[PDB]
DNA sequence: GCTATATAAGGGCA
DNA sequence: TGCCCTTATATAGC
């Protein structure tokens, strides 16, 4: 699909974070007692942690009725898993709705299949880069348009994060592609 | 396991 | 105020 992805590479979506408002106060201890695949340690974190096999995800359910869903490989899968959780809560006795579902972070990654001269890339783009190999082996590239953060490795492996729309993930990778090429390690 | 990245939700505390 | 708490996930040298 060289028309949409000129580099001929499509970043793989790895993790999606979403939120939804169940729109009802939830008794968390009641839920932690009735729910099987759930864990709740208020002294550690103020949320019940639930999980489902398909789509493989984890939800953080708060007393406020708010809910975080993480782990899905796509946006649809995240909405889908979010709905299965809402229905679990519904079946637990709370008048749970599904208000304001929103994708909050999309995580993707790809392999350009060639090593990068991270120091040169960093040096040529100081304004956007943070490369301190002794702290983290990857170059932290904070792209301005779109506002996306890329983790660039010597191996040619790239992690694109911070997107709320998958096109931001694709766009960021397309913008960075010619840059990675410019600093290919020979 | 850790280091780092983005992100939401909450309680708790300087 | 504002930071960390926790969860997921790719990446990789500790």
């Amino acid at each position: 699909d060289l028309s949409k992805h000129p580099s001929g590479i499509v970043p793989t979506l790895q993790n999606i974070v979403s939120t939804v408002n169940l729109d009802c106060k939830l008794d968390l201890k009641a839920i932690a007692l009735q729910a099987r695949n759930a864990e709740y340690n208020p002294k550690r974190f103020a949320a019940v942690i639930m999980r489902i096999r398909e789509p493989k995800t984890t939800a953080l359910i708060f007393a406020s009725g708010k809910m975080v869903c993480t782990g899905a490989k796509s946006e649809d899968f995240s909405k889908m898993a979010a709905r299965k959780y809402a229905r679990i809560v519904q079946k637990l006795g709370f008048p749970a709705k599904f208000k304001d579902f929103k994708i909050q972070n999309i995580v993707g990654s790809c392999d350009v299949k060639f090593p990068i001269r991270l120091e040169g890339l960093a040096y040529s783009h100081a304004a956007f880069s943070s490369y301190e190999p002794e702290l983290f082996p990857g170059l932290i590239y904070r792209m301005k348009v779109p506002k996306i953060v890329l983790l660039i490795f010597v191996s040619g492996k790239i992690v694109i994060t911070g997107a709320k729309m998958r096109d931001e993930t694709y766009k960021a990778f397309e913008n960075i592609y010619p840059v990675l090429s410019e600093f290919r390690k020979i």
Side-chain angles (χ1 to χ4, degrees), chain A residues 2-35 38-186:
Chain A
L2 294 315
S3 199
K4 204 286 191 61
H5 300 268
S7 56
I9 305 179
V10 184
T12 293
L13 302 196
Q14 304 290 358
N15 182 37
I16 271 70
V17 176
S18 67
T19 52
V20 64
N21 186 7
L22 297 190
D23 211 356
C24 68
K25 291 297 195 163
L26 309 164
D27 185 308
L28 298 191
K29 186 41 75 174
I31 294 178
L33 303 169
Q34 298 171 254
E39 58 219 42
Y40 174 49
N41 179 14
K43 67 82 142 69
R44 174 183 163 71
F45 192 57
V48 164
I49 297 167
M50 212 169 261
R51 301 181 165 83
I52 63 177
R53 278 187 72 197
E54 319 281 341
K56 194 192 170 192
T57 56
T58 296
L60 300 163
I61 300 165
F62 305 81
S64 62
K66 297 293 194 75
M67 176 173 92
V68 174
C69 186
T70 63
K73 297 303 189 186
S74 75
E75 302 95 302
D76 287 350
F77 279 146
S78 197
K79 188 169 198 171
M80 197 182 316
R83 293 188 298 223
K84 292 189 186 192
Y85 288 116
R87 281 143 42 206
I88 284 175
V89 173
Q90 281 165 2
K91 296 189 82 169
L92 229 33
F94 310 81
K97 304 310 167 202
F98 202 77
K99 186 187 183 180
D100 314 309
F101 168 88
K102 180 178 181 189
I103 299 297
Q104 304 278 2
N105 182 38
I106 298 177
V107 184
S109 74
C110 53
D111 186 359
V112 298
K113 297 183 166 193
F114 63 76
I116 320 300
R117 283 201 309 118
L118 294 189
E119 192 45 71
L121 205 167
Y123 183 75
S124 63
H125 299 245
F128 311 84
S129 314
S130 300
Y131 178 50
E132 297 296 352
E134 293 168 350
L135 305 167
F136 185 63
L139 180 152
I140 311 309
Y141 196 106
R142 294 220 166 64
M143 194 168 279
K144 296 177 172 71
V145 168
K147 268 193 64 163
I148 292 303
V149 175
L150 297 98
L151 304 191
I152 310 175
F153 300 88
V154 174
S155 63
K157 257 67 156 49
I158 317 294
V159 171
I160 303 93
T161 188
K164 281 169 181 273
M165 293 290 278
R166 75 164 59 183
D167 289 341
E168 287 170 341
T169 305
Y170 304 151
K171 186 61 165 43
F173 173 69
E174 287 308 314
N175 294 351
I176 206 72
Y177 193 65
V179 182
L180 305 175
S181 291
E182 180 179 0
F183 297 95
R184 168 160 62 82
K185 182 186 296 197
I186 301 179

